[PDB]
Amino acid sequence: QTIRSASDIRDVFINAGIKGEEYDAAWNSFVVKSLVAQQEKAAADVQLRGVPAMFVNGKYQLNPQGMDTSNMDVFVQQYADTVKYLSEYEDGKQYTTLEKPVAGAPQVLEFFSFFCPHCYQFEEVLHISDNVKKKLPEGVKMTKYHVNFMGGDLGKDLTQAWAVAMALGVEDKVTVPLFEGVQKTL
Q1: What family is this protein classified in?
Q2: Which fold has domain 1-186?
């Protein structure tokens, strides 16, 4: 169940409960085609240099380097808070303001890769994700986009695979199995 190829990614989806026909149907769908393009554009729109990264309303970029890292606990609590705050802490510290705002951007957008070790931690060690969306205000959702500038050929397939996950609404079912399958390969 390690992920070294496209078919391996398919296997993980199947073992998550998505049937191969549904996966293939979505893999080749218009919506998924459109989602891979938008994942790429949205990264380009904020001039994304790397992951993990998080942006609020196309306006603000979370700045974990300007956060209290005394310990893990305090850091996770402050990160989930800055997200709460901005979705309603001084500029240049816990967050920065984008020069040219991205209109039409999701309320809260995280960028990640199944290849990125700090992304695996953010998601399944620090639980930054779970922790921010447990404090996220009502009517505000967290979106996650996969980036294709990591992992070569396999990275692009994972970006299209994620588009399928979003297309079918099975993000919660495959996130962990996908992180595990790629990180095990490391």
Answers
A1: Belongs to the thioredoxin family. DsbA subfamily.
A2: Glutaredoxin (3.40.30)
